[PDB]
């Protein structure tokens, strides 16, 4: 038989529902969201880190003539100056002391510590959700992982389940994602080839070992004046360390709806938002007819003290007249009340106690025990406690 429910998508809390077949005894089901991983699709466009401005050795012709040569290095800067007359230890490395034409060379390349400390930039698309579900029916339990699309099914040896789509789609990521050492930043990056001096992504390369390193961080050379040979070179400061200094806080600390963002692969784990529509094809062998499970004759609701707290702060007592000993399940069929227990042992003549939780200040919920229903009327006092370390399992309705 196929049963479709609207489970709230909050991990860690159970959701209880009771199936009602026309000619069969009711059976209890309990669905728990043990895990839910929201994994977007990412592609690497470049990587960045702190660059090392490697300086090639200058070389001089005595009084010849030089020319600038075009190269493919990252931010290749080439500048030709006039007479320098260099000094190393003997004070004469060049004859013909007029027009000692000198060549200056400078380009940037990755630091050797960029194999760990590097920032990768990512762009993400519409993200799909995959949820892990633990289901029990009667006495038999099952664990299953499925995708949230409304199309992909899940199977654990007897079961067919269809989950999705999400009623309110949510993505904590922006369009631009930066990963550094496991920390996720929703910081906008300049595009490929459009570098900014002194800002993020001033050096770009497809991988750490790629030879197609492209950058432009504004190296300008200066004419040297000292007799000792040395090339002067002045720069904009690296934008990687400036972006490190002006980082802000990561999305492990600022993502909404309270979920830990995990990396490798980039994903969001245990993130409660919206409701999940799930349709469960329960196998027919789990069901049992109403002639085998004992039914009660009459049942009345005697309600104890109740508190509309986030914990099971309500007590209730049901007296029952039955025909045989059995294992009737319990279910409160209102949207404002849940039960601690899902099943109990039922005698012939006797009474049992049960616990419940609610959120409305009044109690107008309906209680079932093997099919038939009996209303309960009570008034719940405001809770003495202010903050409890257990989430609200239920939501308050409109003007209820």
């Amino acid at each position: 038989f196929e049963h479709a429910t609207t489970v709230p998508n909050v991990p860690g809390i159970p959701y209880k529902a009771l199936v009602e077949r026309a000619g069969y005894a009711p059976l209890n089901l309990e669905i728990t969201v043990v895990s839910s991983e929201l994994t977007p699709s990412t592609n690497k466009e470049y990587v960045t880190c702190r660059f090392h401005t490697v300086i090639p050795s200058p070389q001089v012709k005595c009084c010849g003539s030089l020319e600038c040569k075009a190269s493919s290095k990252a931010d290749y800067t080439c500048r030709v100056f006039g007479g320098v007359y260099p000094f190393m230890w003997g004070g004469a490395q060049c004859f013909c002391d007029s027009e000692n034409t000198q060549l200056s060379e400078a380009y940037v390349e990755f630091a050797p510590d960029c194999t760990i400390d590097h920032a990768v930039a990512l762009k993400v698309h519409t993200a799909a959700l995959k949820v892990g579900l633990r289901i029990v029916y009667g006495n038999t339990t099952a664990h299953l992982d499925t995708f949230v699309n409304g199309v992909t099914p899940g199977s654990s040896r007897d079961l067919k389940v269809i989950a999705g789509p999400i009623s309110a789609a949510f993505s904590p990521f922006d369009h631009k994602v930066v990963i550094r050492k496991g920390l996720v930043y929703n910081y906008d990056f300049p595009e490929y080839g459009a570098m900014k001096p002194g800002a993020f992504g001033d050096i770009q390369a497809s991988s750490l070992d790629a030879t197609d390193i492209v950058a432009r961080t504004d190296i300008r050379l200066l004419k040297p004046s000292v007799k000792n040979i040395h090339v002067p070179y002045t720069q904009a400061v690296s934008g990687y360390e400036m972006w490190k200094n002006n980082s802000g806080r990561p999305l492990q600390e600022t993502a909404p709806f309270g979920c830990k963002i995990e990396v490798e692969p980039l994903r969001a784990s245990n993130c409660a938002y919206g409701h999940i529509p799930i349709s469960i094809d329960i196998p027919d062998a789990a069901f049992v007819r109403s002639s085998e499970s004992p039914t009660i004759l009459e049942v009345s609701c005697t309600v104890a003290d109740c508190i509309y707290s986030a914990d099971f702060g309500g007590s209730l007592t049901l007296q029952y007249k039955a025909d045989r000993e059995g294992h009737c399940p319990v279910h409160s069929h209102s949207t404002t009340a849940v039960l601690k227990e899902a099943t109990t042992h039922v005698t012939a003549v006797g009474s049992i106690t049960l616990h419940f939780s609610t959120s409305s200040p009044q109690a107008n919920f309906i209680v079932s025990l093997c099919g038939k229903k009996t209303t309960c009327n009570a008034e719940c006092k405001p809770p003495a406690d202010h903050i409890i370390g257990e989430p609200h399992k239920v939501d308050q309705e409109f003007q209820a």
Binding site: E253, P382, A384, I387
Partner: peptide, 28 residues
Amino acid sequence: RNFSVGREGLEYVWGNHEPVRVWAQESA
């Protein structure tokens, strides 16, 4: 520090500890 919490909850991380989630009740 006075921190206002909502009904949906609030998670605070104090140092390098495990994050602890709290939720507000309706104790009006």
